[PDB]
Amino acid sequence: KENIFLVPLKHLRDSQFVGELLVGTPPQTVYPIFDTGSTNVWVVTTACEEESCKKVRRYDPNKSKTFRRSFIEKNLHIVFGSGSISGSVGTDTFMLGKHLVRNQTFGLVESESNNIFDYISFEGIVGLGFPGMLSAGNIPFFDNLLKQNPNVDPQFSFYISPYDGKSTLIIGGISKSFYEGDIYMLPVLKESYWEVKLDELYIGKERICCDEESYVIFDTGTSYNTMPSSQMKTFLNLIHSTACTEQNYKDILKSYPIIKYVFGELIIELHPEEYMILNDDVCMPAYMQIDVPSERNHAYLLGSLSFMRNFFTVFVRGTESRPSMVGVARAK
Ligand SMILES: C[C@H]1C[C@@H](N2C(=N)N[C@](C)(c3cccc(Nc4cnc(C5CC5)nc4)c3Cl)CC2=O)CCO1
């Protein structure tokens, strides 16, 4: 009975962090993406006979004594970048870091449509968002874990470290060996994504955003950072792709601007060596244009590669005594 426990995260060859999850009895091992930009739990099953599903640990429900199916024909389909996932719904017992989660609803990947799944070794998703993005089931996975493990405090934090393979997901609390200084908490505006109000956004000395209401989403399943299309045009007029090598990377980016996010009295800065990534012989901005249609108010994503590699993020679920908050600190 470990009230504070650690689930080690392994950065795969691509742009996602996966951890160990046991599904069923006797347990079957899968390595799903731990996602805070969605809520549903997906697991890749043996009913999927495509090569994209092969060469990856597949979960067989016919070998689980605790797997139960229902007669309601609730079929799930979610878009997943270039591909899409389609499957049925069921319930089984899960185990995440020596903690049992019984009678949990999850999606069973039965068809993988398009080569993205073959590249990333897709084995499932474990959503950690708020209820309301749950497509099927009565209770989300993380909510059910806290219910069946009352001693665990309703919070988890991500320590992202892809360079050395020491990334980890800590559930139930925080450790000073993953961050330095003090954590600044931000209130969560709307309980769909892990969303936070954004007051101002500065590219160098120029104010580019927050004429209208804008928000920040902390998505551990999105590698890059994002801005709306309107601000992304201004972003690239000031920030350009340049040729660089591993030896001259620091001197070339010495002239580049500092990106400042304003959260009330808190200011978060992304230095050029922190938001510029080296691919082949060019340094490119780790930023994307995604227009989030969930809320007409356009929002900004803080991802795993650029933001979380340098900042320790804390996801505090609200209870009857505290509201839901996101806390950020400098990574150690
Ligand atoms: C408002 C947010 C919601 C986000 N969002 C998720 N966070 N979850 C889902 C399941 C998701 C969709 C697509 C990709 C990924 N993840 C992933 C990343 N990168 C690579 C490497 C190959 C390039 N493969 C996979 C994921 Cl997790 C659904 C989804 O829309 C997307 C950005 O807007």
From Swiss-Prot:
Coiled coil: none annotated. Glycans are attached at N103. GO terms for biological process: entry into host cell by a symbiont-containing vacuole; protein autoprocessing; protein processing; proteolysis. Active at pH 5.5. Residues 17-329 form the Peptidase A1 domain. GO terms for cellular component: lysosome; transport vesicle. Autocleaved into a p16 prodomain form and two mature forms p44 and p51. It is found in: Cytoplasmic vesicle, Secretory vesicle. Its EC number is 3.4.23.-. The active site is at D35, D219. GO terms for molecular function: aspartic-type endopeptidase activity. Disulfide bonds join C48-C53, C209-C210, C244-C283. Inhibited by small molecule 49c. Inhibited by small molecules WM382, WM4, and WM5. Keywords: Aspartyl protease, Cytoplasmic vesicle, Disulfide bond, Glycoprotein, Hydrolase, Protease, Signal, Zymogen. Belongs to the peptidase A1 family. During the asexual blood stage, processes key proteins essential for merozoite egress and invasion of host erythrocytes. Cleaves and activates proteases SUB1 and SUB2. May process members of the EBL and Rh protein families. Also cleaves apical membrane protein AMA1. During the mosquito vector stage and probably in ookinetes, cleaves CelTOS. This is Plasmepsin X. The gene is PMX. The chain holds residues 232 to 570 of 573 of the full protein.
